[PDB]
Amino acid sequence: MNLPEDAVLVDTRPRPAYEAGHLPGARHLDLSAPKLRLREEAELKALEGGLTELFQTLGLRSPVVLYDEGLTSRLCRTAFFLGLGGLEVQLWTEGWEPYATEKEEPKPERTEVVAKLRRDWLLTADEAARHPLLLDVRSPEEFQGKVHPPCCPRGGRIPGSKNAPLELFLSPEGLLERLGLQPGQEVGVYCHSGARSAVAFFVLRSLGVRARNYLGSMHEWLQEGLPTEP
Ligand SMILES: [Zn+2]
């Protein structure tokens, strides 16, 4: 993979791996999946302000190249938030390893970049509720409501959603065909709390699909008391 000029590098691996050696100048950022509630404009503006503080503290600016060992959930989750904030991002999953030589962590000066939410990358609960096609990337047992995590009130799925377990997205060849999709089509993706839905989002976008990521996912849906199946 070729790199764009003057790129800022972000390493999404766990800290010990980062400290054992990272690309010169790369910042460490391995974001966990927050449980977000995005219903009011003020909540969307708070997510945005949080990304601004993050971007400035890490000295980020476009273009950003994020790297990790393979297409990991943390790489995708982290890259999704940076791109969601308006930064131009790219994922680098192989080929950077020979350059992971730096042990010292950079202490860049803050930048003054300001995040601006990219609404076409996102789905709020209300937008997801009106979406023509949502893909639930959890396991079939979760999709069928047979099991659920203890932080949620019951097992279930968003009504009308279709199950596309995450593992399917690791085999892009013929994926759209198998999922019954085509380039340009509007598709939403979700899971429990947006932890791994970004993997499906990036894979689908790379295939030309207008994918949108419902970060709130099942957890927000259930906390809101929205309609569910079974
Ligand atoms: Zn939950």
Please supply descriptive tags for the structure shown above.
230 residues, monomer, metal ion binding, 8 strands, 8 helices, 2 domains, 12% strand, alpha/beta, binds zinc ion, four-stranded parallel sheet, Oxidized Rhodanese, domain 1
Structural write-up:
This is Probable thiosulfate sulfurtransferase. With 230 residues, this protein is of the alpha/beta class. Helices cover 29% and strands 12% of the residues. The chain folds into two domains: 1-118, Oxidized Rhodanese, domain 1; 119-229, Rhodanese-like domain (Oxidized Rhodanese, domain 1). The chain has helices at 15-20, 41-57, 73-84, 125-129, 140-143, 175-179, 197-206, 217-224, and strands at 8-11, 27-28, 64-67, 89-92, 134-136, 162-163, 186-190, 210-213. The strands form two sheets. Strands 2-1-3-4 form a four-stranded parallel beta sheet, with helices on one face. A four-stranded parallel beta sheet has the order 6-5-7-8, covered by helices on one side. It is globular and about 50 Å long. The termini are far apart. Bound molecules: zinc ion (ZN).
Global geometry: globular
What Rg, in angstroms, do the CA atoms define? Answer: 18 Å
The CA-CA distance between the termini, in Å, is 45 Å
Q: Return the domain count.
A: 2
Helical content stands at 25-40%
CATH class of the largest domain: Alpha Beta
Q: Which CATH architecture of the largest domain? A: 3-Layer(aba) Sandwich
Strand content: 5-15%
Main beta sheet: strand number and arrangement? 4 strands, parallel
* Fourth-level CATH superfamily of the largest domain: Rhodanese-like domain
CATH topology of the largest domain: Oxidized Rhodanese, domain 1
Q: Give me the side-by-side strand order of the main sheet.
A: 2-1-3-4
Structural class: alpha/beta
Number of strands: 8
- The number of distinct helices, counting runs of at least 4 residues, comes to 8
What compounds are bound to the protein? zinc ion
Order of helices and strands: EHEHEHEHEHEHEHEH
Organism: Thermus thermophilus (strain ATCC 27634 / DSM 579 / HB8)
Domain Rhodanese: 3-108, 128-230
Pfam family, one: Rhodanese
InterPro entries: Rhodanese-like_dom, Rhodanese-like_dom_sf, Thiosulfate_sulfurtransferase, Thiosulphate_STrfase_CS
